[PDB]
Amino acid sequence: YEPQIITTDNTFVSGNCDVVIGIVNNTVYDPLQPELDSFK
Amino acid sequence: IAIPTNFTISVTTEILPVSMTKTSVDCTMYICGDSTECSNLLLQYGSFCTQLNRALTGIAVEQDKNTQEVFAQVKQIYKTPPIKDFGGFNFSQILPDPSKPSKRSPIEDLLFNKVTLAQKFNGLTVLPPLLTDEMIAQYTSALLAGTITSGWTFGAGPALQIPFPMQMAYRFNGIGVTQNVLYENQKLIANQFNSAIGKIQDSLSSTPSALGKLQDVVNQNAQALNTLVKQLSSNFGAISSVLNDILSRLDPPEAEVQIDRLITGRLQSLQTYVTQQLIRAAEIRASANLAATKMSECVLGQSKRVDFCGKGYHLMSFPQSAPHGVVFLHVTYVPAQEKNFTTAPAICHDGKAHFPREGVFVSNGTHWFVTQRNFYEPQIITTDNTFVSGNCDVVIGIVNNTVYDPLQPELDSFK
Amino acid sequence: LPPLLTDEMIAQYTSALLAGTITSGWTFGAGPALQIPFPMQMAYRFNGIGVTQNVLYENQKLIANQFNSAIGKIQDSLSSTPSALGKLQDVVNQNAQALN
Amino acid sequence: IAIPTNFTISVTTEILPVSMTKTSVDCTMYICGDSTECSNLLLQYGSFC
Amino acid sequence: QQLIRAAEIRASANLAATKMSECVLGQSKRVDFCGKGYHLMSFPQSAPHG
Amino acid sequence: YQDVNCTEVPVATPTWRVYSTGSNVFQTRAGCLIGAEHVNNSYECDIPIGAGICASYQQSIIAYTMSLGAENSVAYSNNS
Ligand SMILES: *[C@@H]1O[C@H](CO)[C@@H](O[C@@H]2O[C@H](CO)[C@@H](O)[C@H](O)[C@H]2NC(C)=O)[C@H](O)[C@H]1NC(C)=O
Ligand SMILES: *[C@@H]1O[C@H](CO)[C@@H](O[C@@H]2O[C@H](CO)[C@@H](O)[C@H](O)[C@H]2NC(C)=O)[C@H](O)[C@H]1NC(C)=O
Ligand SMILES: *[C@@H]1O[C@H](CO)[C@@H](O[C@@H]2O[C@H](CO)[C@@H](O)[C@H](O)[C@H]2NC(C)=O)[C@H](O)[C@H]1NC(C)=O
Ligand SMILES: *[C@@H]1O[C@H](CO)[C@@H](O[C@@H]2O[C@H](CO)[C@@H](O)[C@H](O)[C@H]2NC(C)=O)[C@H](O)[C@H]1NC(C)=O
Ligand SMILES: *[C@@H]1O[C@H](CO)[C@@H](O[C@@H]2O[C@H](CO)[C@@H](O)[C@H](O)[C@H]2NC(C)=O)[C@H](O)[C@H]1NC(C)=O
Ligand SMILES: *[C@@H]1O[C@H](CO)[C@@H](O[C@@H]2O[C@H](CO)[C@@H](O)[C@H](O)[C@H]2NC(C)=O)[C@H](O)[C@H]1NC(C)=O
Ligand SMILES: *[C@@H]1O[C@H](CO)[C@@H](O)[C@H](O)[C@H]1NC(C)=O
Ligand SMILES: *[C@@H]1O[C@H](CO)[C@@H](O)[C@H](O)[C@H]1NC(C)=O
Ligand SMILES: *[C@@H]1O[C@H](CO)[C@@H](O)[C@H](O)[C@H]1NC(C)=O
Ligand SMILES: *[C@@H]1O[C@H](CO)[C@@H](O)[C@H](O)[C@H]1NC(C)=O
Ligand SMILES: *[C@@H]1O[C@H](CO)[C@@H](O)[C@H](O)[C@H]1NC(C)=O
Structure with missing residues (x-):
C-alpha cells in the first residue's frame, strides 16, 4: 500500500468510456501543464 | 509475420488416480486353516508371516498418506457468498448443489454414477478409508470457493477478496495480453466460458468410457485377488487339495509330507501376490505425487510451464473429486483468426x-x-x-x- | 515382437518438430502455427532473459558465427569420445545378459 | 559490483533412454518342451504360467 | 527383475517427455533444467532407443 | 474389534473381562471399540481409527468424528 496521485505517466488511454462497466469519474492530473503555464 | 485477431477460451479434462483399496491378509487362516498340526508344521518355517503383514500394513498406511497429501492443502474451510454475481460468469455446474445428495456438484455426481465396480472370504479383509467421501467433497468445495473468491492470494498468506472480472483482467496480464482486451470483450468471454463448461459434462457422459485409468486400476486389483483364491484349490503334487481329507485318510507320519507340499505351494503363491502389490503401490504413489504437484502449481496459481496444464496459454484450473482420484478442468486461452x-x-x-x-x-x-x-x-x-x-x-x-x-x-x- | 513405430517414422516426427520450432518460434505449441523471421525470434528470446533487443541486432554476425561453430564442434565431440553414449548401450547390455 | 561485457553462445548435449526391447516367453514350452508327461504334471501347480 | 527395470525405464521416459514439452516448445526459467546457463532453445534428435 | 456386529464380542482372561462387554461400547464402520466415550463435538485428528473417527485422550479416552478446520467466509462484493 503506497498510494500515489493518478498522473498521466503511470496510466494509459484506450478508447472511450462506454464499453467498460464500472467506470468511475475523476480527473487525471497532468505534469506538463503547470510548467507550460509557468513558461509558455 | 502473422498476428492473431481473435481468441477462444477452452476447458480441458485431466484424470489422475490417487489411491487404491487397502487390503489385509493373515497367513494362518489362509495357508493352513483351523488345523493344529498344520500350524505346528508351519511354525518351523520362521517369521515369514510377520514380515508379510508388516509389508501390507505399510501400503495400507501409505494410501491414507497419499490422500492427505493430495487433498488436505487448506488451513480453513472457505465458503462462497450466498448470492452469485460473478460479473456474468456461471459456476453452477461445479459448485456444490444443496437440493441433491449430500454435497456433490453435478459433475461429481456424474463421475460417481459412471464408475462402477470384495465380500468376506477366508482370511481376507478390507479396511475402510480414513477419509469419507463427504470430507473429500468438503475439501474440494473449500478449494473451489477460495480460488473463485480470493484469486491465488489464499495460497500464499491470508485470503484477500477481489472482484472476479478484475482478477481475470490481470490473469490475462500474465500471458502478455493487456487488460483492456478483457474489459472490452467481457460479455463474449463470459459466454464462451459458460458454453465450454456446459459442453464438458456432455462430453463426459456421451462417451461410454473416457474414465479409463480410474476404472482400470480397480479391475487389476480384483483380478489379482481372484487368482489368489483360485490358487487355494490346487493339488501341488499331493493326494488331495483339502487338508481334512489328507489328515483323516492317512497316519500323521505319512501325511506330514503332503502337508509340507501344500504349505510350500501356498506360501510361494502368497509371496508372489505381495510382491505384485508392492510394485503396483509404488506406481500409484508416483501418480499421487504428480497429482499433488499439479494441484499446488495449477490450482493455487497461474503456471508458465508449457503443456503442464492443458494445451495453450494457461489461465486457471478447477478440481473435482472421483471415486479413487481427482479430475482437473484447465481453462486455457487459444488464439485464432490470424492475419499476416x-x-x-x-x-x-x-x-x-x-x-x-x-x-x-x-x-x-x-x-x-x-x-x-x-x-x-x-x-x-x-x-x-x-x-x-x-x-x-x-x-x-x-x-x-x-x-x-x-x-x-x-x-x-x-x- | 517388433516395435509399433518404425524408425523412419520417428525420424519424421523429429523432423516435423524441428521444422516447427525453426520457422514458427513457439506459437505452434499453443494454437495455430505463425511464421516470424528467425532473427526477430532470437531477439525476443534475448528479451526474455533480461537482455534488450539491440544487443542482438547489433551483434548478429557474431551470434551466427558462434552458433555455427558450436554446432560444428558437437559432431566431433560425439565422434571422438567412445563413451559419449554410455547410457543407451547399458540397457541393451543388461537385457542381453539377463536373457542369456 | 561486477558486470560482464561479452558473451559466448554454447550448446550442450543430453541423452535419455525411452524404451526397451519388447519380448515374450512361451511360458509352458520353456518349462516343459513338448513333453506330454511334463505338461500333465504342470497342470497341478495352478495358474502361475 | 524385468518388472523393476521396466518401471525405471518408464520414469526415464516420463522425464524425457516433460523435457521435450517444456524446453523444445518454449523457453524455460527453471535453472539447470535444460543446459547450464540461461536457456534459449533446444533441438531434438532420435536414437536407437532414446 | 474389526468387522463385528459388536453384540458378539464376549464370545472371544483374568483382567480381560473388563474390556469384554463392559459399560462403554461404541459401534463404528470399522468395528466396535470398547473403552471410549462418544462425544458430539469435534476436534483435530489424534490417533485415527477409520471412516472419520479419531480417538484421543483428555481424564479418559474419547472417540469423536474428525474436524476439517475452522469456517471462514470471505466478504466478497463486486467493488471491494
Ligand atoms: C461522469 O461524467 C460524465 C460526463 O459529464 C457524465 O455523463 C453526463 O452526465 C450529465 C449529468 O447530468 C448528463 O446530463 C449527461 O447526459 C451525461 N452524458 C453525457 C454524454 O454528457 C456522467 O453522468 C458522470 N457520472 C458517471 C457515473 O459516469
Ligand atoms: C471472435 O470470434 C467470435 C466467435 O468465436 C465472434 O463472435 C461471434 O460474432 C458473430 C458476428 O456475426 C455472431 O453472429 C456470433 O454469435 C458471435 N459468437 C458468439 C459466441 O457470441 C467475434 O465477433 C469474433 N471477433 C470479432 C472482432 O469479430
Ligand atoms: C447457470 O447455468 C445453469 C446450467 O447451465 C443454469 O441452470 C439452468 O438454467 C436454464 C435457464 O432456462 C433452465 O432452463 C434449467 O432448468 C437450469 N438448470 C439446469 C440446466 O440444470 C443457470 O440458470 C445459470 N445461471 C445464470 C445466472 O445464468
Ligand atoms: C492502412 O491503414 C491506414 C490507417 O487507417 C489507412 O489509412 C486510412 O484508412 C482509413 C480507412 O478507410 C481512411 O478513412 C483514411 O482516409 C486513411 N488515411 C488516413 C490518413 O487516415 C490505409 O487506407 C490502410 N491501407 C490499406 C491498404 O488497408
Ligand atoms: C532513409 O533516408 C535516408 C536519408 O535520405 C537515405 O539516405 C540516403 O540514401 C541515398 C541513396 O543513395 C544516398 O544517396 C544519400 O546520400 C543518403 N543520405 C543520407 C543522409 O544517408 C536512406 O537511403 C533511406 N533509406 C531507405 C530504406 O529508404
Ligand atoms: C567478445 O568475444 C568475441 C570472441 O569470443 C570477440 O570477437 C573476436 O574479435 C577479434 C578481434 O576483432 C577477432 O580476431 C576474433 O576472430 C573474434 N572472434 C570471433 C569468434 O569472431 C569480440 O570482439 C568480443 N567483444 C568485444 C566487445 O570485443
Ligand atoms: C455491483 O453490484 C450491484 C448489485 O448490488 C450493482 O448495483 C452495481 O452496479 C455493481 N457494480 C458494478 C461496478 O458493476
Ligand atoms: C501474406 O500477406 C500478403 C499481403 O500482405 C498476401 O499476398 C499473402 O497471400 C499472405 N500470405 C498468406 C495468406 O499465406
Ligand atoms: C529478404 O530476402 C530477400 C531475398 O531476395 C532479400 O532480397 C532481402 O534483402 C531480404 N531482406 C532483408 C531485410 O534481409
Ligand atoms: C446387528 O444385529 C442386529 C440384530 O441382529 C441388527 O438389528 C443390526 O442392524 C446389526 N448391525 C449392523 C451394523 O448390521
Ligand atoms: C449428543 O447428541 C445426542 C443425540 O444427538 C444427545 O442425546 C446428547 O444429549 C448430546 N450430548 C451429549 C453430551 O451426549
Missing part, C-alpha cells in the same frame, strides 16, 4: 534507430504501426512507446518512417 503482415527490425528516423518498447512493427501496405505481440490493436508510432539506441547504419533490414512526437504540437501552439 510485413515487418521490420527497427525504424531509422532522423539518423537514429528506434526500437519498440514492447511489441512489434507491422504495416498494412503503406503505413506503419506498433502492436502488441499476441493481439492486433495497432497504434501510432510515438516517442514514448519506442526507445532509441545506436546509429542508423549498423542494423540490417531497417526501414524509413517518421516517428510522431506528442510534445511538439503542444509547444508549437504555446511556444
Whole structure:
C-alpha cells in the first residue's frame, strides 16, 4: 500500500468510456501543464 | 509475420488416480486353516508371516498418506457468498448443489454414477478409508470457493477478496495480453466460458468410457485377488487339495509330507501376490505425487510451464473429486483468426534507430504501426512507446518512417 | 515382437518438430502455427532473459558465427569420445545378459 | 559490483533412454518342451504360467 | 527383475517427455533444467532407443 | 474389534473381562471399540481409527468424528 496521485505517466488511454462497466469519474492530473503555464 | 485477431477460451479434462483399496491378509487362516498340526508344521518355517503383514500394513498406511497429501492443502474451510454475481460468469455446474445428495456438484455426481465396480472370504479383509467421501467433497468445495473468491492470494498468506472480472483482467496480464482486451470483450468471454463448461459434462457422459485409468486400476486389483483364491484349490503334487481329507485318510507320519507340499505351494503363491502389490503401490504413489504437484502449481496459481496444464496459454484450473482420484478442468486461452503482415527490425528516423518498447512493427501496405505481440490493436508510432539506441547504419533490414512526437504540437501552439 | 513405430517414422516426427520450432518460434505449441523471421525470434528470446533487443541486432554476425561453430564442434565431440553414449548401450547390455 | 561485457553462445548435449526391447516367453514350452508327461504334471501347480 | 527395470525405464521416459514439452516448445526459467546457463532453445534428435 | 456386529464380542482372561462387554461400547464402520466415550463435538485428528473417527485422550479416552478446520467466509462484493 503506497498510494500515489493518478498522473498521466503511470496510466494509459484506450478508447472511450462506454464499453467498460464500472467506470468511475475523476480527473487525471497532468505534469506538463503547470510548467507550460509557468513558461509558455 | 502473422498476428492473431481473435481468441477462444477452452476447458480441458485431466484424470489422475490417487489411491487404491487397502487390503489385509493373515497367513494362518489362509495357508493352513483351523488345523493344529498344520500350524505346528508351519511354525518351523520362521517369521515369514510377520514380515508379510508388516509389508501390507505399510501400503495400507501409505494410501491414507497419499490422500492427505493430495487433498488436505487448506488451513480453513472457505465458503462462497450466498448470492452469485460473478460479473456474468456461471459456476453452477461445479459448485456444490444443496437440493441433491449430500454435497456433490453435478459433475461429481456424474463421475460417481459412471464408475462402477470384495465380500468376506477366508482370511481376507478390507479396511475402510480414513477419509469419507463427504470430507473429500468438503475439501474440494473449500478449494473451489477460495480460488473463485480470493484469486491465488489464499495460497500464499491470508485470503484477500477481489472482484472476479478484475482478477481475470490481470490473469490475462500474465500471458502478455493487456487488460483492456478483457474489459472490452467481457460479455463474449463470459459466454464462451459458460458454453465450454456446459459442453464438458456432455462430453463426459456421451462417451461410454473416457474414465479409463480410474476404472482400470480397480479391475487389476480384483483380478489379482481372484487368482489368489483360485490358487487355494490346487493339488501341488499331493493326494488331495483339502487338508481334512489328507489328515483323516492317512497316519500323521505319512501325511506330514503332503502337508509340507501344500504349505510350500501356498506360501510361494502368497509371496508372489505381495510382491505384485508392492510394485503396483509404488506406481500409484508416483501418480499421487504428480497429482499433488499439479494441484499446488495449477490450482493455487497461474503456471508458465508449457503443456503442464492443458494445451495453450494457461489461465486457471478447477478440481473435482472421483471415486479413487481427482479430475482437473484447465481453462486455457487459444488464439485464432490470424492475419499476416510485413515487418521490420527497427525504424531509422532522423539518423537514429528506434526500437519498440514492447511489441512489434507491422504495416498494412503503406503505413506503419506498433502492436502488441499476441493481439492486433495497432497504434501510432510515438516517442514514448519506442526507445532509441545506436546509429542508423549498423542494423540490417531497417526501414524509413517518421516517428510522431506528442510534445511538439503542444509547444508549437504555446511556444 | 517388433516395435509399433518404425524408425523412419520417428525420424519424421523429429523432423516435423524441428521444422516447427525453426520457422514458427513457439506459437505452434499453443494454437495455430505463425511464421516470424528467425532473427526477430532470437531477439525476443534475448528479451526474455533480461537482455534488450539491440544487443542482438547489433551483434548478429557474431551470434551466427558462434552458433555455427558450436554446432560444428558437437559432431566431433560425439565422434571422438567412445563413451559419449554410455547410457543407451547399458540397457541393451543388461537385457542381453539377463536373457542369456 | 561486477558486470560482464561479452558473451559466448554454447550448446550442450543430453541423452535419455525411452524404451526397451519388447519380448515374450512361451511360458509352458520353456518349462516343459513338448513333453506330454511334463505338461500333465504342470497342470497341478495352478495358474502361475 | 524385468518388472523393476521396466518401471525405471518408464520414469526415464516420463522425464524425457516433460523435457521435450517444456524446453523444445518454449523457453524455460527453471535453472539447470535444460543446459547450464540461461536457456534459449533446444533441438531434438532420435536414437536407437532414446 | 474389526468387522463385528459388536453384540458378539464376549464370545472371544483374568483382567480381560473388563474390556469384554463392559459399560462403554461404541459401534463404528470399522468395528466396535470398547473403552471410549462418544462425544458430539469435534476436534483435530489424534490417533485415527477409520471412516472419520479419531480417538484421543483428555481424564479418559474419547472417540469423536474428525474436524476439517475452522469456517471462514470471505466478504466478497463486486467493488471491494
Ligand atoms: C461522469 O461524467 C460524465 C460526463 O459529464 C457524465 O455523463 C453526463 O452526465 C450529465 C449529468 O447530468 C448528463 O446530463 C449527461 O447526459 C451525461 N452524458 C453525457 C454524454 O454528457 C456522467 O453522468 C458522470 N457520472 C458517471 C457515473 O459516469
Ligand atoms: C471472435 O470470434 C467470435 C466467435 O468465436 C465472434 O463472435 C461471434 O460474432 C458473430 C458476428 O456475426 C455472431 O453472429 C456470433 O454469435 C458471435 N459468437 C458468439 C459466441 O457470441 C467475434 O465477433 C469474433 N471477433 C470479432 C472482432 O469479430
Ligand atoms: C447457470 O447455468 C445453469 C446450467 O447451465 C443454469 O441452470 C439452468 O438454467 C436454464 C435457464 O432456462 C433452465 O432452463 C434449467 O432448468 C437450469 N438448470 C439446469 C440446466 O440444470 C443457470 O440458470 C445459470 N445461471 C445464470 C445466472 O445464468
Ligand atoms: C492502412 O491503414 C491506414 C490507417 O487507417 C489507412 O489509412 C486510412 O484508412 C482509413 C480507412 O478507410 C481512411 O478513412 C483514411 O482516409 C486513411 N488515411 C488516413 C490518413 O487516415 C490505409 O487506407 C490502410 N491501407 C490499406 C491498404 O488497408
Ligand atoms: C532513409 O533516408 C535516408 C536519408 O535520405 C537515405 O539516405 C540516403 O540514401 C541515398 C541513396 O543513395 C544516398 O544517396 C544519400 O546520400 C543518403 N543520405 C543520407 C543522409 O544517408 C536512406 O537511403 C533511406 N533509406 C531507405 C530504406 O529508404
Ligand atoms: C567478445 O568475444 C568475441 C570472441 O569470443 C570477440 O570477437 C573476436 O574479435 C577479434 C578481434 O576483432 C577477432 O580476431 C576474433 O576472430 C573474434 N572472434 C570471433 C569468434 O569472431 C569480440 O570482439 C568480443 N567483444 C568485444 C566487445 O570485443
Ligand atoms: C455491483 O453490484 C450491484 C448489485 O448490488 C450493482 O448495483 C452495481 O452496479 C455493481 N457494480 C458494478 C461496478 O458493476
Ligand atoms: C501474406 O500477406 C500478403 C499481403 O500482405 C498476401 O499476398 C499473402 O497471400 C499472405 N500470405 C498468406 C495468406 O499465406
Ligand atoms: C529478404 O530476402 C530477400 C531475398 O531476395 C532479400 O532480397 C532481402 O534483402 C531480404 N531482406 C532483408 C531485410 O534481409
Ligand atoms: C446387528 O444385529 C442386529 C440384530 O441382529 C441388527 O438389528 C443390526 O442392524 C446389526 N448391525 C449392523 C451394523 O448390521
Ligand atoms: C449428543 O447428541 C445426542 C443425540 O444427538 C444427545 O442425546 C446428547 O444429549 C448430546 N450430548 C451429549 C453430551 O451426549
